[PDB]
From a paper:
Glycylpeptide N-tetradecanoyltransferase 1, commonly known as N-myristoyltransferases (NMTs, EC 2.3.1.97), are universally conserved eukaryotic enzymes responsible for a major post-translational modification (PTM), myristoylation (MYR). NMTs are thought to transfer a C:14:0 acyl-CoA (MyrCoA) exclusively to the N-terminal glycine (Gly) of specific substrates. Here we report a series of high-resolution HsNMT1 structures co-crystallised with MyrCoA and reactive substrate peptides. These structures reveal snapshots across the entire catalytic mechanism including the reactive intermediate state, thereby providing the high-resolution map of MYR reaction chemistry.
We therefore solved the crystallographic structure of HsNMT1 in complex with two different peptides (X and Y; see Methods for peptide details) at 2.3 and 2.1 Å resolution, respectively. The product complexes with peptides X and Y (HsNMT1:CoA:MyrX chain A and HsNMT1:CoA:MyrY chain B) fully overlapped, indicating that the state was independent of peptide composition. Of note, in chain A of the NMT complex with peptide Y, both tetrahedral intermediate and products of the reaction (CoA and MyrY) were observed, exhibiting occupancies of 0.3 and 0.7, respectively. In the HsNMT1:TI-Y crystal structure, the tetrahedral intermediate results from nucleophilic attack by the Gly2 amine on the MyrCoA thioester. Comparison of HsNMT1:MyrCoA:X and HsNMT1:TI-Y reveals that the Gly2 amino-terminal group undergoes a 70° rotation around the Cα-C bond on forming the tetrahedral intermediate, leaving a space filled by a new water molecule (wat3). Wat3 likely arises from the water channel as it extends the network. Wat3 stabilises the TI complex through a new H-bond network with the Ile245 carbonyl and Thr282 amide groups. Thr282 appears to play a pivotal role as a catalyst platform by inducing both concerted rotation and nucleophilic attack by the deprotonated Gly2 amine. Tight packing of the Gly2 Cα against the Tyr180 hydroxyl, Asn246 carbonyl and MyrCoA thioester carbonyl groups in the TI structure prevents accommodation of an Ala side chain, thereby contributing to specificity for Gly. To address these uncertainties, we examined our structures to assess the effects of peptide binding and product formation on the Ab-loop conformation. This conformation was closed in all our structures, with the exception of the tetrahedral intermediate complex, in which it was partially disordered. Although this cavity has evolved to accommodate a charged aa7, its side chain is disordered in HsNMT1:MyrCoA:X in contrast to HsNMT1:TI-Y, where the Ab-loop is disordered and the substrate aa7 side chain interacts with Asp471.
Residue numbers in the entry: 115 to 181, 185 to 315, 318 to 407, 414 to 496
The structure:
């Protein structure tokens, strides 16, 4: 295969086996000050997402041009503020491309800062998300310019490694995960053709029926007082994997404190009053009118069996009106996916590091979930 752009980047080649650990190129001690040249008639713009009108341009750009062409992500403004303004976010890392004459938003890419644990190293990186080019500008080499410009802007802040994911295979995946789906409203999914029959319709609704209330004693929504223990449980739980975030307590609050229609977190508080487990999933609908999906986030278990935790996750999602519950085969999720009646999806998710050469890993050692 020929990768015009990626062959010029500090990433391992596809097919080269990696047995080393470390950067591909050194930290840069002088950085291009000038933005990379866009095609004529387009210009860079850093998007102030605290401007409601500018945020509305971005979700319009994303809702209409982002990821069989039946279902498109329907990102909401409030979800985007959550994904794009975690602790340490920078406005110049909300990199947008506008038509010069009309100022219409036609491309975007974002970086947010994360401390990343990869094997035996902890490194300050960025996470790259929401790379989007208007359908009209496609195959005009604008995506590589966006990648180069966000790289430049991240170098300016002294950061030289990134993590990112993609559905397509690029040089070179550190890990490969697969999406799985758990029908919660089987009628609706079959109607809008997201799932198909295998077996009567009546048999299917019984097959997927869930309890009306969770079975775990002491389950309840996360509260402000749970922020420390949630942070402690997560940090300890993540040590067993090989690619994980290292979150501060403020980061834990941002990513797990519940926000309606964005992020749900439930903790298990036992008969002694100690929080010993939590489950979490985010909300991301897709346009078809709409398909309400929940996405498995981070699920930590120390006293409740993981199979019971996720069973409760499905139940709460069902109760909250979601149509489907999605989850990757990473961390220990393979231990519950089949038993809890998930079906395997058709889309992969490849995980990548920029400027870090290291052996690849099984899905089960990936302990990092992005939005
Ligand atoms: C230290 C800091 C480092 C920070 C930077 C780290 C790197 C960040 C990398 C980005 C992380 C984003 C992660 C998530 O957000 S992935 C989200 C992906 N976005 C979508 O799927 C939304 C719908 N698609 C689009 O909006 C466009 O089709 C996109 C923008 C995807 C491509 O636009 P376009 O269709 O008009 O193509 P082109 O003619 O301009 O250019 C083609 C070149 O671009 C390479 N390409 C195509 N798709 C992707 C992709 N998803 N990741 C990386 N590279 C990609 C491709 O291999 C080819 O290079 P090469 O094959 O010749 O080598
Ligand atoms: N990704 C879901 C839906 C696929 C719909 C057809 N592209 C499963 O697999
Ligand atoms: N969800 C798809 C998956 C196809 C095969 C994916 N490995 C189906 O069962 O129709
Ligand atoms: N990447 C997703 C696209 C659709 C999002 C909603 N399931 C799959 O494939
Ligand atoms: N395979 C894919 O399309 C991956 C994408 N993140 C969806 O979900
Ligand atoms: O097809 C296949 C899986 C089944 C649910 C949606 N995607």
């Amino acid at each position: 295969r020929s990768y015009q752009f990626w062959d010029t980047q500090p990433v391992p080649k596809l097919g080269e086996v990696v047995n080393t650990h470390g950067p591909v190129e050194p930290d840069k001690d002088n950085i291009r000050q000038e933005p990379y040249t866009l095609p004529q008639g387009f210009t860079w713009d850093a998007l102030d997402l605290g401007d409601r009108g500018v945020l509305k341009e971005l979700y319009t750009l994303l809702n209409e041009n982002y990821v069989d062409n039946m279902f498109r992500f329907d990102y909401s403004p409030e979800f985007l503020l959550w994904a794009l303004r975690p602790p340490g976010w920078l406005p110049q890392w909300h990199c947008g491309v506008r038509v010069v004459s009309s100022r219409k938003l036609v491309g975007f890419i974002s970086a947010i800062p994360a401390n990343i644990h990869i094997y035996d190293t902890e490194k300050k990186m960025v996470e790259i998300n929401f790379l989007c080019v208007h359908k009209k500008l496609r195959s005009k080499r604008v995506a590589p310019v966006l990648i180069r410009e966000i790289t430049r802007r991240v170098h300016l802040e002294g950061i030289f490694q990134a993590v990112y994911t993609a559905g397509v295979v690029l040089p070179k995946p550190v890990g490969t995960c697969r999406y799985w789906h758990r029908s919660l409203n089987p009628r609706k999914l079959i109607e809008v053709k997201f799932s198909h029959l295998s077996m009567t319709m009546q048999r299917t609704m019984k097959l997927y029926r869930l309890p009306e209330t969770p079975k775990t004693a002491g389950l309840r929504p996360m509260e402000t007082k749970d922020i420390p223990v949630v942070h402690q449980l997560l940090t300890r739980y993540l040590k067993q994997f090989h690619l994980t975030p290292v979150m501060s307590q403020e980061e834990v609050e941002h990513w797990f404190y519940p926000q309606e229609n964005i992020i749900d977190t439930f903790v298990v508080e036992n008969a002694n009053g100690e929080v010993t487990d939590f489950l979490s999933f985010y909300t991301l609908p897709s346009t078809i009118k709409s398909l309400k999906a929940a996405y498995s986030f981070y699920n930590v278990h120390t006293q409740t069996p993981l199979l019971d935790l996720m069973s409760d996750a499905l139940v709460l999602a069902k109760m909250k009106g979601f149509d489907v519950f999605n989850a990757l085969d990473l961390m220990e999720n393979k231990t519950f996916l089949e038993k809890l009646k998930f079906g395997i999806g058709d889309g992969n998710l490849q995980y990548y590091l920029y400027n870090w050469k290291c052996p690849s890993m099984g899905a089960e050692k990936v302990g990092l979930v992005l939005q």
